[PDB]
Design a protein around this ligand. Structure first.
Ligand SMILES: [Mg+2]
Ligand SMILES: [Mg+2]
Lengths: 189, 165, 63, 165, 149, 63
């Protein structure tokens, strides 16, 4: 007997002896849940590490050309004491208008000599065609003058020429948390 | 680590995906019916908040997770995207910065604003807006957007009001 | 006060507890003995307020 | 075996996929910049080995796993496939027999030559070639191929050289 | 009778071809750093003791020398502040910058040229110079790149 | 020694000390089985619950 092997009246049964047959391991069923917008995951930063983010408005891009923009930080972390601060894993993603002309991509590498050449070498690349319009520079830039980054632009290409402020781009960046966040200021100056 | 002989089971519309609500935090929703939209342009409606929770008593509440999905006629004209941000100066500017955004080309046409608004006055919403863009122009009421939000229970459903003052 | 050794004021508990927006409607006042130019002086405001949550975690890759 | 209510998490470009290297076996890589290719034809470059490990000392080394991915301008002209085999007599003949092959229509445009070359002289490679084909003709430097290989550490980084002979 | 590097320290070397020069005059050349380490990432690494030596054609002019110092305003004066110097007249055509730079941004040196003087004017690619430099080995060193790009 | 770390003759080996590196958790491989028509699932009803079914023929629908 085995599965629902419960009937009525007699009914013998025999099998055969050999070297088994079925697969060695057995099955497990599953059910991929359908996820909606934003349900994703915004992994928390790490130890004593802050994640400073902010965006930069786009520049009128052309046909199939690709522009660049030395990225600069905000006044807060723009302190010589914080400039020489260390960074962690970091990502870039981009918010853009709904009515978009063609599909396009974007990345970031050391102040490239050749602007288009960037895409031939960057670790990750925010692609529009992809479901995830963003790139993860995990350990890619871990450790670096929180100023170093300045000399190092970001690259963006477009299939169809396009306007400026036509799209922003955020940069969630891991970096050691400063000390300002806490304590006030010396009353005695 | 021997491989796992598995099997993706087929999911049929409206199946599973049960979404438990948090404790004390009750979820209440409704919807605003679209107003005619032009081709590729994106309208926006202030929060169509329901009077049920307009009392400064509860209007001065807080929120958390907030869903947003939509119903469109079968005769859906192409595709459309939707979302919500802080009374966006520029209309289309909203899509350039929301945490989520429901789309018609997505298996699940809905957007989850996971905690992105956690701890905000229930009133604090009206200074918000909902933005919807469409491929080709289209009518009003043509689409309904469903603001599914969770927050808390107040001090009224609890009981009626003054018999004799 | 400028005449004082400590050119600053402490609003300890003075404003403890308040919509981090409330403050907006509430201006700041400055008086001068001798008329004076603009950008003639700045003023900082070290303010205690509950730490937010952005400081930590990144952003949902899935948008 | 009750079903497992699971949930595929979204993977964003350059995420995870950490590729640990083997012990003692150090991995070193670089790249050769494409030379103009014609439409549908497939060029081939001998192994553009780096001088860093040209010394017969290390050139007489061995290998193992070997990756190969490529960077192409956003203005990528259609699609292209790439790989590597034994100084293939016929150029296109290489694609008819490599263990792996990076393609532009693949989510991950790269090829993993898993052990397929394990135990081969580091020099033994130069009598190898890298083959790349393109849908429509295209320029040179237009694409870069990245030979990511692992092998071992020698006896030099270890130290400088003769002060006074 | 050999030599050794340091703990967790790599010795990255490479050469730079000479640009022809005039006699008695001394040229300079910012540093041709190796791309592999041009990443601000490791470009901001720690260096150790480092040395420079030079291979040159046999058939070469009068005995000349060469060193390295901060972006020196005076090409010739760089030899008065040089820590060590590769002399041709010496039996050792090289200079040891031990602990002279021990502990500095791998990207620091960039803002710091190399100086070479010559008795008789001389051709380009007429002589090379190698730079055996101690620096902490970085990360990736022993693990591939995420295929997911 | 570790993986196939079995060779011939001597051959020492050393590593390095730091703060680890690899991911925290480790991998599991799988194989999505290909399912055919009807293999799916007709979940059984519940307690003291019947499942009554039946169909209704369509009506000429328009554009
Ligand atoms: Mg520095
Ligand atoms: Mg309030």
């Amino acid at each position: 007997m085995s599965t629902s092997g419960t009937g009525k009246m007699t009914r013998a049964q025999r099998r055969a002896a050999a070297r088994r047959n079925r697969w060695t391991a057995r099955v497990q069923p599953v059910i991929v849940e359908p996820l909606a917008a934003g349900q994703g995951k915004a992994i928390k930063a790490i130890a004593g590490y802050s994640i400073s983010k902010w965006e930069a408005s786009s520049d009128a891009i052309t046909a199939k050309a690709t522009n660049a923009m030395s990225i600069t930080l905000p006044h807060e972390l723009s302190s010589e004491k914080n400039k020489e601060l260390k960074v962690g894993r970091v990502l870039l993603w981009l918010g853009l208008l709904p009515s978009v002309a063609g599909r396009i991509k974007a990345c970031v590498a050391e102040k490239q000599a050749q602007a288009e050449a960037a895409f031939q070498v960057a670790l990750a690349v925010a692609d529009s065609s992809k479901e995830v319009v963003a790139a993860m520079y995990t350990d890619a830039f871990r450790g670096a003058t929180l100023g170093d980054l300045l000399n190092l632009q970001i690259y963006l290409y477009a299939s169809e020429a396009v306007p400026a402020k036509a799209v922003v781009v955020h940069l969630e960046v891991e970096h050691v948390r400063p000390t300002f966040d806490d304590f006030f200021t010396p009353v005695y100056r």
